[PDB]
Design an enzyme around this catalytic site. Structure first.
Site, mmCIF file in Angstrom:
data_model
loop_
_atom_site.group_PDB
_atom_site.id
_atom_site.type_symbol
_atom_site.label_atom_id
_atom_site.label_comp_id
_atom_site.label_asym_id
_atom_site.label_seq_id
_atom_site.Cartn_x
_atom_site.Cartn_y
_atom_site.Cartn_z
ATOM 1 N N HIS B 41 0.800 -1.208 0.000
ATOM 2 C CA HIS B 41 0.000 0.000 0.000
ATOM 3 C C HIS B 41 0.843 1.272 0.000
ATOM 4 O O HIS B 41 0.286 2.378 -0.002
ATOM 5 C CB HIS B 41 -1.072 -0.051 1.087
ATOM 6 C CG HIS B 41 -0.576 -0.034 2.493
ATOM 7 N ND1 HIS B 41 -0.417 -1.177 3.252
ATOM 8 C CD2 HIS B 41 -0.226 0.999 3.280
ATOM 9 C CE1 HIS B 41 0.017 -0.836 4.459
ATOM 10 N NE2 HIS B 41 0.142 0.487 4.502
ATOM 11 N N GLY B 143 2.916 5.733 9.813
ATOM 12 C CA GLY B 143 4.295 5.719 9.361
ATOM 13 C C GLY B 143 5.034 4.448 9.790
ATOM 14 O O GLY B 143 6.189 4.258 9.424
ATOM 15 N N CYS B 145 4.016 1.298 9.327
ATOM 16 C CA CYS B 145 3.952 0.229 8.344
ATOM 17 C C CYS B 145 5.340 -0.151 7.843
ATOM 18 O O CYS B 145 6.204 0.706 7.576
ATOM 19 C CB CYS B 145 3.048 0.574 7.166
ATOM 20 S SG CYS B 145 1.309 0.631 7.665
#
Ligand SMILES: *[C@@](O)(c1nc(C(=O)OC)cs1)[C@H](C[C@@H]1CCNC1=O)NC(=O)[C@H](CC(C)C)NC(=O)[C@@H](NC(=O)OCc1ccccc1)C(C)C
Ligand SMILES: *[C@@](O)(c1nc(C(=O)OC)cs1)[C@H](C[C@@H]1CCNC1=O)NC(=O)[C@H](CC(C)C)NC(=O)[C@@H](NC(=O)OCc1ccccc1)C(C)C
Lengths: 306, 306
Positions: B41, B143, B145
């Site tokens: 993503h 942030g 991820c």
């Protein structure tokens, strides 16, 4: 969201850890520039520990009696001295992986990460607070002496702790990096015990704010109180007194949540009088006191190191 | 003695973390050899997240649309692909600090360390279990991820987790390093929820042994039980069933303590029926289930990495 007890990343400190042997006693040392720091009782046998005379034990040692290994490679010792309860060994090679660093002496209530080590090799990392009775609740076995505690500020490692001993009830005592003990303990195998510990009130208040930030707010009540009133009840539950300094320190969490410090003090008061009645806060069934206001801010805004 | 939740030393993983940007979306990546792994993503805008078509979003991307920074230095991307929910970027330089490593898919109940990262920089480390409902109780902000979870075996890092999302109640979901989700979650901003979680019985039993080892043995009672009897009561308290495999795994702690597994099961049963009546075990006011038998052995015998 979510809130965890979180240690600093350990890589910068892993690079500094060595094994130190004198005769048949081995423990860990910290190698920074061309000095290796370690607990002075490396120079003792287990009989000597009952009542050591460190000046007499040492004076009979020379540089070559100290074996320092970093990985499988020996460091050459070219000088030694004793400062309080640490030994400093001058070696002929600067640690190429030395970080930017400082030595600090922390106050009760302040937290730090421990890199627990055996034979100069890391085994794991965890977070500790300096308790009001000058102990820490660690996890340490034989061979762990010389493991260090630290904080990181961006790229700068502040060493605050070196591990020396365990006391009754499985709590731990050690020194700053100038070899001065936290608390009135001595590096001797004679009966010693810490005093009654208290709860670090400012830290409990920080953790309650952490809870509200993470959406766990069932314990917020409709009362306020004063600092004196709060302190009266605090004393009875063996909580440390709250000061104006503490209030000021909590200012940022107060601002982020819209809850005045004294309103949060009233919620804590009610938790102390009534307990949690089987409920949890941030997954805990008791009131946690090993997060500083700074710890909470850092974790809640994702501050980062390098 | 003492018993702490303890993460693996993070240095080997710190060396692998990079920042990945595509357009205005930034997150963390893991750089191993000449491949960087990150959540797919990264290729989405925050509008796209409501219902992304990943194949259509991707096919319109080329190598140069991906910005990979390691420190203040840019890595040149020479190839990309999507495997399940991770993106792999081929870069033209092998990570010089790549450790010995493996990718593994863990089972529910297994624990691991998380190095939580922001902008390719580490912020801290903590220990997690894969819950029976395929979530973890982490601490993650926007942030984070691409932060990874791992175990270390001597010098070998097993990556087991990459962080992707947060679900209702502040719990976390992610993938293995082949990009397959733990649990039936998807990488889309649509209402999703984990199922009812259960307690990891084998881990609670490990932690009780840890307590006895550390001298905290007030809860040992004078009863025994059977696996079936225990399981009947377990089910009622939303504990996972105990199996013969679990009994076998606890064999070493059983041997070290002289307490048969089934005797310890009877003590747990009584804790479940009666509660702890205001007492603590290893400083906790509830029964902890995020230490594996292996975790307990490791910490109680001081195993070390390098
Ligand atoms: C440290 O790792 C090492 N010590 C030696 C050593 O002395 O070599 C001869 C080598 S490595 C350990 C770490 C301990 C072990 C268990 N948990 C820890 O944190 N330190 C010691 O072994 C230490 C040595 C001191 C005296 C400098 N001794 C102790 O920690 C002992 N505590 C003690 O003697 O004081 C408290 C006490 C209470 C009650 C009766 C007597 C003494 C404990 C008992 C092992
Ligand atoms: C990750 O760090 C990043 N995501 C992006 C991104 O999507 O860029 C456009 C960049 S960095 C975060 C980490 C999250 C933030 C809060 N805590 C975390 O662990 N991931 C997300 O933002 C993530 C993107 C997914 C959809 C791939 N979205 C979520 O985690 C969201 N969860 C979700 O959409 O599903 C659950 C849900 C429940 C109820 C209603 C709707 C959805 C949450 C809500 C932020």
């Amino acid at each position: 969201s979510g809130f965890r007890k979180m240690a600093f990343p350990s890589g910068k400190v892993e690079g500094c850890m060595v094994q130190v042997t004198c005769g048949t006693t081995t423990l860990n040392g910290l190698w920074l520039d061309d000095v290796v720091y370690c607990p002075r009782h490396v120079i003792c046998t287990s009989e000597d520990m009952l009542n050591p005379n460190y000046e007499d034990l040492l004076i009979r040692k020379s540089n070559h009696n100290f074996l320092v290994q970093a990985g499988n490679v020996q460091l050459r010792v070219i000088g030694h001295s004793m400062q309080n309860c640490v030994l400093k060994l001058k070696v002929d090679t600067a640690n190429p992986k030395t970080p930017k660093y400082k030595f600090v002496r922390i106050q009760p209530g302040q937290t730090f990460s421990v890199l627990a080590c055996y034979n100069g090799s890391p085994s794991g990392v965890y977070q500790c607070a300096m308790r009001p009775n000058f102990t820490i609740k660690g996890s340490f076995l034989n061979g762990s002496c010389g493991s260090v505690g630290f904080n990181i500020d961006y790229d700068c490692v502040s060493f605050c702790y070196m591990h020396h001993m365990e006391l009754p009830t499985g709590v731990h005592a050690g020194t700053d990096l100038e070899g001065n003990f936290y608390g009135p303990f001595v590096d001797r195998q004679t009966a010693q015990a810490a005093g009654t510990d208290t709860t670090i009130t400012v830290n409990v208040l920080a953790w309650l704010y952490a809870a509200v930030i993470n959406g766990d707010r069932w314990f917020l009540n409709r009362f306020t109180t004063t600092l004196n009133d709060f302190n009266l009840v605090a004393m009875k539950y063996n909580y440390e007194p709250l000061t104006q300094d503490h209030v000021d320190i909590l200012g940022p969490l107060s601002a982020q949540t819209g809850i005045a410090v004294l309103d949060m003090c009233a919620s804590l008061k009610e938790l102390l009088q009534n307990g949690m009645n089987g409920r949890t806060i941030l997954g805990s069934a008791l009131l946690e006191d090993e997060f500083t206001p700074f710890d909470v801010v850092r974790q809640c805004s994702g501050v980062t190191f390098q």
